[PDB]
Scaffold this active site. Structure first.
Site, mmCIF file in Angstrom:
data_model
loop_
_atom_site.group_PDB
_atom_site.id
_atom_site.type_symbol
_atom_site.label_atom_id
_atom_site.label_comp_id
_atom_site.label_asym_id
_atom_site.label_seq_id
_atom_site.Cartn_x
_atom_site.Cartn_y
_atom_site.Cartn_z
ATOM 1 C CE1 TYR A 196 5.545 -70.255 53.191
ATOM 2 C CE2 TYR A 196 3.715 -71.317 52.073
ATOM 3 C CZ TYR A 196 4.219 -70.258 52.804
ATOM 4 O OH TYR A 196 3.424 -69.189 53.135
ATOM 5 C CG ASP A 225 2.510 -64.262 51.066
ATOM 6 O OD1 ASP A 225 2.882 -64.124 52.257
ATOM 7 O OD2 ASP A 225 2.383 -65.373 50.509
ATOM 8 C CB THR A 275 -30.101 -40.276 29.238
ATOM 9 O OG1 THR A 275 -29.474 -39.095 28.758
ATOM 10 C CG2 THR A 275 -29.460 -41.481 28.545
ATOM 11 C CG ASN A 276 -34.398 -36.854 25.806
ATOM 12 O OD1 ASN A 276 -34.972 -37.952 25.909
ATOM 13 N ND2 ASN A 276 -35.077 -35.718 25.678
ATOM 14 C CG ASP A 305 -31.606 -36.544 32.443
ATOM 15 O OD1 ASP A 305 -31.479 -37.297 31.453
ATOM 16 O OD2 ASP A 305 -31.571 -35.287 32.362
ATOM 17 C CG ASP A 337 -31.185 -31.421 34.317
ATOM 18 O OD1 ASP A 337 -31.572 -32.494 33.813
ATOM 19 O OD2 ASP A 337 -30.452 -30.598 33.711
ATOM 20 C CG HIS A 391 -0.083 -61.560 55.451
ATOM 21 N ND1 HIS A 391 1.244 -61.415 55.075
ATOM 22 C CD2 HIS A 391 -0.693 -62.406 54.582
ATOM 23 C CE1 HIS A 391 1.403 -62.198 54.018
ATOM 24 N NE2 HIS A 391 0.266 -62.807 53.683
ATOM 25 C CG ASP A 408 -26.855 -33.044 30.048
ATOM 26 O OD1 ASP A 408 -25.599 -33.008 30.047
ATOM 27 O OD2 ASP A 408 -27.578 -32.047 29.819
#
EC number: 3.3.2.10
Lengths: 546, 546
Positions: free
Chosen positions: A465, A334, A122-123, A8, A184, A523, A10
């Protein structure tokens, strides 16, 4: 054998329960016990609250019906409601207070990892309040971790009607004895139990998780903290911008808010930021994670001079122009970290803030060519090996799986000797042909990089490079400038090439520089210590970039 | 014959000139005349301001050198500067006050349209102030309208050094007698004139434009107001999100700020919002212009039920989930307008605000099938023609150029009889095979639509009309709801299908509805009256959506 778990929202995945706030309101305002709970349930199946949960009316249409119910209940109880009584105020603060129950969410994620299908049943209501974004934000964080989200107001059914439990089983494709159901509210467990499902009544979180461990046979309480949420390439929004003829840049985009541009290093991908992209979007940022020029789905022209810093920086400005962004926060690592310092130096008006992981800002020396400075330090010998076109390409493309498995390793798992690379005749000359998998990456993650480098190879990436002299000449134009916009330098203790000591004089050039330092980090910073990186970037963004 | 026009930024394209604010500061603070101008130029070529304009130092590094210059000048003049004297405050307000000189920008746009190459040649600085975004925003709006932007601080040269004029001619690929050069500073015109260029000294805008008209032979003053800026497809950022297997949505994206989602009608494209996308981004919104499902680069599955409103709305929610957006403003036109009302009704938590062009919100009638309601009104007869799969496809795909040239017309240029379409045996049965070009669109714009419909055809687009019963059944679930989030309805006087009178009872369902109305406007609202649409949407967004 259980194979599905239903939660649930809530009172189970989010606390405190909105229903429990009614009890606290009654005590605070000195109302008769249960008064607000009776008005809330007034009418049962024919009542206003049932109509709201079924999606017949919206929350704003329900608010005045609930106020009417509160007055009718107080009339029979012979009591008066205070002059300042407002159902809107009460519900606004109850929804605002509700936060994710992190231990419950972690248990659901662990079950999903172990093969379970997970769902939220869920409600809930159609929220049209002026403050509805807070609820939308909560649902968005939650729904990404579950296989199914079944909302009462979207299906026209409510718990505890037996129809919604039948709908649930049809959606899950499972029989009742294969499902664990957590709620619950006791009345909501009764139909699930009549069907034969395992039910857990949730009063306190820890006892509910102890019951869940016992039925699943999986440890959920006391386990190590999980790694941050990583993103799936097929679930991302992919963007493509042409910055000039033959040069198109690809990026992935997530979130709303101030733009943050992530710039990877060599030989990487936008995928190197997989652990940061969901975390930064959740913190309130619009994340743009680039495939830098020469990489993945971005264009990779063969010419060396297409990768000099002056051209790369101009294209990144054009990228902001075409997206309609006046500024972005630039975060690099890097080679990307080097680019972000040059963006701050040459286009400060476009850079909201600048951060570099590992890469320090080192000003150009006008008295010494960069090729002579590199020969003095034996750890940068591999950069001399990278100079001749075709040589390092042939070795790095020979076996892609070997290339990425040998590079992407933690500091204690090193398999590459970075000394006398030129004299040895290669990077992998005294290295295993089949190296073991580093604890840092999975085989699936390695294969993503393998597939990306099958497209353009290493020519584009290695060209970054091959412009040392061109970059040095251009950088010499900025020797009289200082970096006076917000800046962060993050050092990694065990990067044996980009050592933390190389950054020690940065304060001379960036007087208000902020610092971060990661212990036991090599690294590959983003994937070596993702939680630490996330915490450092989020704290800095929230204080200096927003 | 002139073929290039060069403009200065400060004092020419943007007013007031930052240099002129120094004169006003001297009068306001009762300082000796010329004091601030002498400190500004102190040192000439070796001076702090020259170093700033060459890019050697940033604006923040220059501010204290200028303050020092102000004190040394006041010492020789035997005067004292006030206690509250601040170069930062003075420059902050001078830069803030500067706005685009709209008549000058319009003259530059007209020259560019007539074949001229245009450039900005400016003496400017690297702005690293905390307020630098305002300048970045100004430069972004300007640079999109010029072929070249040459900034002194990026090239290491300043006007009036003769080297920058030589650099300019090399960049333009033109000889001096082919260039018009506009500047407000006399000393800056001298080198251009020595080379043989036509020069215009800009004191007041109108006299400068009168001189410009005389040398170019082109009318620039007193011409009609131009149409809004339209966007070029190849300059846009294209995004692709997979919302479910086999369903990918394409969109174009521009700007930063609250998300605004644009939803086109039938048979259109994201391109139908070309005049709104730059205007909404410039107003401070992040615009997402969709290719709706079945269109352009979005997926087009053949199944009819892939285009019912329930599926289309669910996919638009998933689209927000995958982009990491909790909410968006939804703006729709025609079929897209219908979709945006259903987004507000079923997912209000995800919709910041809702606007529809032409399409009214009409609640479902539970006592009458929509197929019977359509037969009562003779103007909706073409929707019955669209019902049988394959029939309207064959006619609409037979000649694409004819299809788009016949549909995209102004209200006075109608060539299609929309009555008895079924009895006539087609939409184009008594229509010309080669219709003339409407004044609303160019041949190039028509060809964009032609190319987009060569990919998937009309099956996907026509399927939006083939789910009347399915849409009606789904809409019946919302009959008890009201739309209580911010909403705008824009009616078009001459839309003879979606008439303004069809929207008259909308206030019963959307009690706080805002309205807009466009006179002399037909069905193709965005391209028929773009300036009017832009003004109405921007005003509403600024007041109710932000």
């Amino acid at each position: 054998t259980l194979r599905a778990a239903v939660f649930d929202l809530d009172g189970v995945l989010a606390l405190p329960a909105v229903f429990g706030v009614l009890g606290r309101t009654e005590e605070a305002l000195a109302l008769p016990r249960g008064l607000l709970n009776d008005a809330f349930q007034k009418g049962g199946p024919e009542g206003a609250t049932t109509r709201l949960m079924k999606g017949e009316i919206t929350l704003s249409q329900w608010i005045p019906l609930m106020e009417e119910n509160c007055r009718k209940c107080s009339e029979t109880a012979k009591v008066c409601l205070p002059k300042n009584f407002s159902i809107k105020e009460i519900f606004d603060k109850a929804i605002s207070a509700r936060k994710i129950n992190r231990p419950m969410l972690q248990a659901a994620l662990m079950l999903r990892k172990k093969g379970f299908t997970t769902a939220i049943l869920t409600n809930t209501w159609l929220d049209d309040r002026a403050e509805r974004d807070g609820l939308a934000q909560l649902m968005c964080e939650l729904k990404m971790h579950f296989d199914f989200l079944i909302e009462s107001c979207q299906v026209g059914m409510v718990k505890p009607e037996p129809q919604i439990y039948k709908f649930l089983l049809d959606t899950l494709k499972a029989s009742p004895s294969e499902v664990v159901f957590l709620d619950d509210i006791g009345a909501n467990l009764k139909p699930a139990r009549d069907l034969g499902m395992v039910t857990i009544l949730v009063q306190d979180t820890d006892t509910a998780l102890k019951e869940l461990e016992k039925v699943t046979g999986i440890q959920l309480l006391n386990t190590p903290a999980p790694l941050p949420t990583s993103c799936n390439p097929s679930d991302m929004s992919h963007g493509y911008v042409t910055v000039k003829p033959r040069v198109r840049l690809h990026f992935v985009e997530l979130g709303s808010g101030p733009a943050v541009c992530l710039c990877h290093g060599f030989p990487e991908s936008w995928y190197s930021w997989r652990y940061q992209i969901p975390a930064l979007a959740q913190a309130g940022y619009r994340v743009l994670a680039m495939d830098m020029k020469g990489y993945g789905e971005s264009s990779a022209p063969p010419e060396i001079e297409e990768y000099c810093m002056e051209v790369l920086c101009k294209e990144m400005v054009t990228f902001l122009d075409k997206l309609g962004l006046s500024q972005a926060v630039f975060i690099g690592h890097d080679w990307g970290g080097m680019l972000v310092w040059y963006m701050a130096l040459f286009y400060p008006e476009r850079v909201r803030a600048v951060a570099s992981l590992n890469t320090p800002f080192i000003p150009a020396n006008p008295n010494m060519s960069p090729l002579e400075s590199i020969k003095a330090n034996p750890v940068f010998d591999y950069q001399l090996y990278f100079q001749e076109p075709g040589v390092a390409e042939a070795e790095l493309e020979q076996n892609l799986s070997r290339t990425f498995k040998s590079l992407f390793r933690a500091s204690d798992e090193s398999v590459l000797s970075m000394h006398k690379v030129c004299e040895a005749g290669g990077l992998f000359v005294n290295s295993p042909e089949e190296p073991s998998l580093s604890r840092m990456v999975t085989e699936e993650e390695i294969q993503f990089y393998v597939q990306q480098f099958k497209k353009s190879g290493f020519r584009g990436p290695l060209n970054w490079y091959r412009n040392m002299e061109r970059n040095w000449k251009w950088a010499c134009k900025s020797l009289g400038r200082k970096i006076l916009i917000p800046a962060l330098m993050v050092t990694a203790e065990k990067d044996f090439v980009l050592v933390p000591q190389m950054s020690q004089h940065m304060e001379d050039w960036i007087p208000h520089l902020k610092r971060g330092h990661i212990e036991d980090c090599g690294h590959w910073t983003q994937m070596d210590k993702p939680t630490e990186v996330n915490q450092i970037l989020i704290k800095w963004l929230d204080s200096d970039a927003r």
